[PDB]
């Protein structure tokens, strides 16, 4: 809630040193580094902030002059935001910090320049970055010696201004002494360092910022700062050798799934084998017969069913990722290496089967060539409707948004977050007399042909609508919202809690929504003021993907995180990815009882991995009382083959629980048990060893 306040501004400048040993942070210590472009504090100014901090602790004050983020000395800015502290730093593009220090709110700076405010221009709570300006961090070469300099911390020579030395080791920084040997820091000793820049020692260039600190038994401390995401192009794909990767962005019409693999199997030879992976079985199948006809010269194969043992089919194979998740790892590798090329289509989707397959094949990637691919519209902001309040005779409530009734004479698509909103909106629009229909996941797309035949129509849909055909579409109304499973992770059992949550769509999702119109005629586009987020949050799907590693005892989360650093495809939540990795270790510490793996395979339970995780504490699944409208009912969602027990008085030691299960426990005044097995205790304690700093 609170407003971040700059309390101190430390001006700095480069300072070449032959040896930096005497500058190194070393809590609790007593009694050769190599050179570095060090940082020297040049001046310390303390902000004069008027105790009217109370506002800020409340929220922003007075008539505070806006200030461009360049109008500072090259400096490190000490920040206080409520009870939390952290840092920000100037660069060419302005000032950068991390979301968990600033919450993406404007800075209050009380300078030798008066009451000023610096505007947060972008914020990503997933990557933990906030930009007061535009990001300018350089890339870091693997292996580089780097450091973090804290102008307030005391070094081993009793002076203030201390360095934590680092070495870049893949997707993280390993803490080292000034002489390069591994170093341990209690995370409590690095608290308040987040937001500080990370400098490359040979240059002094900023190469990242401090976000997350991770300790792990008998290893050196690691700082995690995330990763940086990265026609006549078939030539570059054809030069590739096994062990190389290339990412492709292609237009929504260049048939990246069609001509690109076809051109490639052409230049290399129609006898070779190319693999193309697509998320949905339907999309793989459809493409496989649009290509099978139009290109008679080339053989075409399709894999969406049973495992097809010993397969060396020639030509282009279209397959679903799920087809290969059936395979144990040596079969998967054996099959995977027999392709010349592997195309990963629609990688932005980050489905569980996608994430597991990309993690799994990456463990042997040195034998593969992998390519990953992905009129005027008048826009308006519709205001939130008071909900049960009158709006007038020329506006109507559509999905909680004030829309002028005149649009109802047009062909409308409404984007709604939930199943329920889609059904209820379509229904009140018929009861008020309009030609409405609805669509959500698992519905059959043919059922809209009776709505869309009769203009004006209005279709109300979730994100599930986007392969469907809305003829003569004029206007889109967009809540800005979607409804997906989300996870929250904790050091207290249950460590894992999942549940559906309404959330803002991504920038890319919002674009596809807006892009339903303006296609053959001009379009109109009404949207809420809800703000789209930067990255698709794939952690729930990554959680579910861990399943495909149980058989082979592979930590899917860690294989994914290493893959992602190599191929630079997804943004990283360093805190959450690390927490998921630790829990994934617990999942694969012992082999799953066969009866569990079977019950998982035949159950209608929607999160089978929940039984895998909970087997570490209990073998009897429990039936929790259902929730309806935030209250505990007396119904029970019984599940297949789970000889469960009613919760009643005895709440089970779940490692993994749903939101409704957790809500049920809380409403009943009950308590979740503490871990009973030493593997589960140890996971809980290792979860305490990653923190936003």
């Amino acid at each position: 809630r609170h407003i971040p306040v700059v309390t101190d501004i430390y001006s700095i400048e480069d300072h070449r040193l032959e040896d930096t040993t005497h500058l190194q942070y070393a809590p609790n210590a007593i009694k050769g580094s190599g050179p570095a472009v060090c940082k020297k504090v040049t001046e310390h100014e303390k902000c004069t902030t008027s105790i009217m901090l109370t506002a800020f602790f409340g929220v922003m004050p007075r008539g505070t002059t806006p200030r461009a983020p360049v109008r500072f000395p090259t400096s490190l800015l000490k920040i206080r935001r409520g009870l939390e502290t952290g840092w920000a730093y100037t660069h060419q593009g302005g000032i950068s910090s991390v979301d968990h220090v600033t919450c993406g709110k404007d800075l209050l700076v009380c300078d030798t320049m008066g009451r000023t405010r610096v505007v947060c221009q972008s914020n990503n709570k997933m990557t933990d970055e906030s930009e007061y300006g535009v990001k300018t961090d350089s890339g870091c070469p693997e292996g580089a010696r780097c450091y973090v300099f804290n102008p307030e911390a005391v070094n081993i020579s009793g002076t203030k201004g201390a360095m934590v030395h680092l070495q870049k080791t893949g997707g993280e920084f390993t803490c080292v002494t000034a002489s390069g040997t591994p170093a341990f820091f209690d995370l409590k000793n690095l608290k308040g360092w987040a937001g500080l820049p990370i400098f490359e020692a040979s240059s002094g260039r900023v190469v990242g910022r401090v976000k997350v600190g991770k300790n792990e038994d008998s290893k050196p401390t690691k700082l995690m700062s995330g990763i940086q995401t990265v026609t006549e192009m078939v030539k570059k794909i054809t030069t590739m050798n096994r062990g190389e990767f290339r990412q492709i962005t292609l237009a929504t019409g260049a048939g990246k799934t069609t001509e690109l693999p076809r051109s490639v199997i052409e230049e290399i030879g129609r006898h070779k084998r190319v693999l193309v992976l697509i998320p949905l079985r339907a999309a793989a199948e459809s493409v496989y017969q649009y290509m099978r006809q139009k290109h008679p010269s080339i053989a075409f194969n399709l894999r969406i069913g049973e495992m097809k043992e010993g397969d060396m089919a020639t030509g282009i194979t279209y397959a679903s990722y799920g087809y290969f998740c059936q395979m144990p790892q040596p079969k998967l590798r054996a099959a995977m290496v027999e392709y010349s090329f592997i195309f990963l289509d629609e990688y932005h989707c980050a489905t569980p089967e996608q994430l597991a397959i990309m993690g799994k094949i990456h463990r042997f990637s040195e034998n593969l060539r992998v390519v990953a691919m992905t009129h005027p519209i008048e826009e308006f902001i519709a205001p939130e409707v008071m909900k049960g309040e009158d709006l007038g005779s020329e506006y109507l409530d559509i999905a909680g948004l004030k829309i002028p009734v005149e649009e109802m004479k047009s062909n409308m698509l409404v984007f709604v977050p939930t199943r329920n909103m889609a059904v209820e909106t379509a229904k009140k629009l018929k009861a008020k007399g309009y030609n409405s229909g609805y669509y959500y996941s698992g519905e059959d797309p043919s059922n809209l042909r009776v709505v869309t035949s009769q203009s004006p129509y209005v279709v109300v849909a979730t994100n599930a609508i986007e392969g469907v055909t809305l003829p003569d579409l004029d206007v889109v109304v967009d809540t800005g919202l979607k409804c997906e499973k989300r996870i929250r992770l904790s050091s207290k059992m249950p460590f894992i809690v999942t549940g559906l949550k309404r959330m803002a769509v991504t920038i890319g999702e919002q674009a596809q929504r807006r892009g339903r119109v303006g296609r053959v005629k001009p379009g109109r586009y009404y949207r809420s003021q809800e703000t789209p987020v930067g990255s698709k949050d794939y952690h729930y799907d990554l959680l579910q993907a861990q399943r495909y590693g149980i058989e082979d005892g592979i930590n899917i989360t860690k294989s994914f995180r290493e893959m992602n650093y190599d191929w630079s495809l997804y943004e990283e939540d360093s805190l959450m990815i690390t927490q998921l990795e630790i829990l994934n270790n617990l999942l694969i510490s012992e082999e799953l009882p066969m009866a569990v793996k079977n019950i998982m395979a035949r159950t209608d339970h929607p999160e089978p991995i929940q039984l895998a995780y909970n087997s570490y504490e209990t073998q009897v699944p429990v039936l929790f009382p259902k929730i309806r409208n935030g209250e505990v009912t007396d119904s029970y969602d019984n599940y297949t083959f789970l000889n469960a027990r009613k919760l009643g008085d005895d709440v089970p030691p779940y490692v993994y629980a749903t939101e409704d299960e957790d809500l049920a426990v809380e409403l009943l005044g009950l308590d979740w048990p503490d871990p009973g097995n030493q593997g589960t205790v140890e996971a809980g304690r290792a979860l305490k060893q990653v923190v936003g700093l």
Side-chain angles (χ1 to χ4, degrees), residues 2-30 32-49 51 53 55 57-70 72-114 116-230 236-251 253-269 272-292 294-305 307-330 332-385 388 390-645 647-693:
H2 325 72
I3 286 275
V5 181
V6 176
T7 74
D8 297 271
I9 293 171
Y10 292 83
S11 310
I12 54 160
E13 73 176 26
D14 290 7
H15 184 37
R16 315 186 72 92
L17 247 22
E18 290 320 306
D19 191 282
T20 67
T21 305
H22 63 290
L23 301 175
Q24 79 196 294
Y25 192 52
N28 308 312
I30 265 115
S33 68
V37 182
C38 292
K39 308 290 150 168
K40 189 167 195 303
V41 171
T42 278
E43 192 219 306
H44 172 199
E45 171 181 3
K46 181 165 150 198
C47 280
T48 60
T49 309
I51 315 101
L53 303 75
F57 216 137
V59 82
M60 193 95 261
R62 58 136 98 35
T64 177
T65 317
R67 194 213 285 230
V70 187
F72 290 90
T74 298
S75 61
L76 304 175
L77 314 193
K78 172 83 166 307
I79 281 173
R80 181 166 246 112
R81 201 267 304 167
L83 309 172
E84 312 226 69
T85 74
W87 294 85
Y89 60 95
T90 60
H91 49 95
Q92 173 278 305
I95 290 162
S96 293
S97 186
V98 302
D99 165 79
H100 83 257
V101 168
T102 59
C103 302
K105 302 177 188 325
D106 303 332
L107 303 179
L108 192 269
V109 186
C110 288
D111 217 331
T112 48
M113 248 215 41
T116 50
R117 111 180 72 90
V118 179
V119 166
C120 180
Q121 296 181 26
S122 69
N123 194 54
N124 188 320
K125 317 192 74 79
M126 173 148 132
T127 64
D128 198 16
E129 301 179 344
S130 45
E131 302 304 331
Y132 301 79
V134 180
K135 183 188 183 173
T136 67
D137 294 339
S138 299
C140 191
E142 204 255 311
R145 284 286 296 265
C146 303
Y147 64 90
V148 180
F149 171 79
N150 182 314
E152 285 192 349
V154 168
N155 51 61
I156 43 81
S157 41
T159 285
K160 111 165 166 178
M163 294 168 59
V164 160
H165 290 84
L166 301 168
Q167 178 176 320
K168 191 193 180 180
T169 53
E172 67 202 359
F173 298 84
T174 297
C175 296
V176 292
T177 67
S179 66
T181 60
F184 168 83
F185 297 95
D186 195 300
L187 264 18
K188 236 73 161 190
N189 281 321
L190 263 8
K191 171 206 258 306
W193 290 50
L196 277 170
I198 302 178
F199 298 105
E200 180 185 51
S202 54
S203 57
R205 306 181 199 111
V206 176
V207 102
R209 66 193 77 159
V210 176
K211 300 173 185 162
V212 163
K214 165 185 44 157
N215 276 327
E216 188 175 304
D217 175 64
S218 66
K219 293 176 316 136
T221 307
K222 315 289 180 44
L223 299 183
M224 305 187 59
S225 295
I227 73 106
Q228 199 75 231
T229 42
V230 155
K236 301 164 104 90
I237 302 295
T238 41
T239 80
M240 294 172 81
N241 284 322
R242 300 169 112 73
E244 273 161 54
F245 166 90
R246 253 182 164 285
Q247 178 265 4
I248 305 308
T249 300
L250 250 191
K256 58 204 163 57
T257 319
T258 60
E259 324 300 329
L260 185 60
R262 187 262 302 145
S263 330
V264 157
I265 194 149
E266 225 151 276
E267 238 294 337
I268 76 176
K272 316 215 186 154
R273 313 176 70 221
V274 173
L275 195 55
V276 173
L277 298 182
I278 298 167
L280 289 167
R281 302 170 77 256
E285 196 268 359
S286 161
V287 165
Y288 143 80
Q289 272 149 359
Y290 166 66
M291 296 298 294
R292 226 193 51 193
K294 187 176 43 156
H295 298 282
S297 34
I298 304 97
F300 283 88
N301 314 280
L302 172 79
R303 301 293 181 264
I304 62 184
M307 192 155 336
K308 207 289 159 175
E309 310 274 337
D311 194 31
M312 292 283 287
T314 166
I316 288 174
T317 293
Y318 293 107
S320 69
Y321 297 78
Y323 165 71
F324 292 100
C325 295
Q326 297 169 332
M327 310 183 79
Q329 178 78 350
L332 171 68
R333 160 187 182 119
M336 276 298 165
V337 306
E338 297 311 329
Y339 293 96
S340 300
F341 283 76
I342 300 181
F343 287 91
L344 316 172
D345 197 32
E346 311 287 44
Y347 73 87
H348 62 284
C349 289
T351 70
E353 294 74 37
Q354 267 186 316
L355 296 184
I357 287 304
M358 301 170 66
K360 278 163 87 68
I361 71 173
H362 179 271
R363 290 173 75 70
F364 52 82
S365 79
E366 69 283 359
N367 317 294
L368 317 164
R369 318 166 209 247
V370 171
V371 184
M373 342 171 281
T374 176
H375 311 62
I377 300 154
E378 291 177 291
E379 318 189 352
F380 309 95
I381 305 195
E384 307 288 41
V385 170
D390 176 282
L391 284 169
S393 53
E394 319 292 309
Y395 296 89
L396 43 61
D397 181 338
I398 292 172
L401 297 177
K402 195 175 177 181
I403 301 288
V405 173
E406 192 83 24
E407 301 285 15
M408 294 314 277
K409 319 198 180 170
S410 209
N411 295 333
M412 175 179 288
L413 209 210
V414 185
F415 282 99
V416 125
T418 62
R419 214 156 281 217
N420 276 20
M421 272 194 67
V423 168
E424 52 108 342
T425 306
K427 301 350 287 170
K428 90 200 205 110
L429 282 179
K430 261 259 164 187
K432 299 175 201 292
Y434 311 86
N435 175 38
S436 75
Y438 70 87
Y439 184 85
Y440 52 73
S441 88
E443 291 302 285
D444 186 71
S446 322
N447 286 29
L448 297 167
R449 308 213 61 168
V450 297
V451 175
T452 62
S453 59
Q454 172 188 316
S455 309
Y457 67 84
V458 48
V459 173
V460 189
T462 64
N463 255 350
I465 197 145
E466 53 150 39
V468 187
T469 305
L470 280 40
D472 215 57
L473 197 63
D474 299 320
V475 44
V476 163
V477 177
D478 178 8
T479 57
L481 294 177
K482 70 172 171 179
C483 189
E484 306 192 335
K485 294 272 184 84
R486 185 191 270 146
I487 77 187
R488 46 184 175 100
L489 301 177
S490 170
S491 269
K492 184 218 218 331
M493 248 173 56
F495 307 143
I496 299 181
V497 179
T498 67
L500 287 170
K501 288 247 145 38
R502 285 174 210 75
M503 57 195 71
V505 298
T506 68
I507 297 162
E509 283 163 336
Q510 178 136 99
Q512 314 172 60
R513 291 193 177 180
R514 181 192 168 275
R516 302 307 286 244
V517 293
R519 280 173 147 162
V520 298
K521 35 159 43 181
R524 300 166 72 90
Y525 170 79
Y526 298 73
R527 67 168 171 79
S528 80
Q529 44 81 9
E530 203 85 31
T531 304
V533 292
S535 12
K536 182 167 206 304
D537 189 337
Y538 55 77
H539 295 113
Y540 171 81
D541 286 318
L542 177 53
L543 172 55
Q544 303 307 296
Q546 298 180 176
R547 193 190 186 254
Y548 298 125
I550 297 183
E551 193 65 63
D552 327 313
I554 288 165
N555 194 313
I556 294 293
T557 308
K558 167 153 149 144
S559 285
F560 164 88
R561 180 170 66 89
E562 261 143 39
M563 175 281 301
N564 188 35
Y565 168 70
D566 201 349
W567 294 350
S568 305
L569 293 178
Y570 306 99
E571 315 215 90
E572 175 183 277
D573 189 324
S574 291
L575 176 60
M576 192 153 313
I577 196 71
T578 304
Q579 294 168 318
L580 273 172
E581 193 172 285
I582 289 164
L583 285 148
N584 205 150
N585 287 322
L586 173 68
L587 181 67
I588 64 153
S589 52
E590 302 306 339
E591 318 199 52
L592 252 201
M594 265 283 311
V596 178
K597 301 212 271 315
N598 312 133
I599 280 180
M600 275 170 70
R602 292 200 138 106
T603 192
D604 65 346
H605 185 293
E607 280 166 68
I609 195 157
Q610 179 187 26
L611 318 163
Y613 266 102
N614 286 343
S615 66
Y616 284 91
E617 287 282 328
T618 169
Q619 55 288 53
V620 312
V622 173
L623 252 268
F624 285 69
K626 303 224 313 168
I627 263 58
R628 196 188 101 97
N629 306 346
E631 303 278 312
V632 169
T633 88
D634 215 335
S635 308
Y636 297 92
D637 259 19
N638 219 289
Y639 282 117
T640 278
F641 305 154
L642 275 38
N643 198 197
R645 60 171 192 84
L647 172 69
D649 200 73
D650 174 35
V651 10
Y654 273 11
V655 168
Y656 183 139
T658 73
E659 292 282 353
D660 287 344
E661 290 170 350
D662 189 61
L663 179 63
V665 171
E666 183 75 73
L667 292 183
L668 301 181
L670 310 181
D671 288 282
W672 283 106
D674 298 318
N677 300 309
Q678 181 68 29
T680 302
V681 173
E682 271 171 22
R685 295 183 54 73
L687 289 168
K688 316 216 164 40
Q689 300 283 267
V690 231
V691 310
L693 283 168

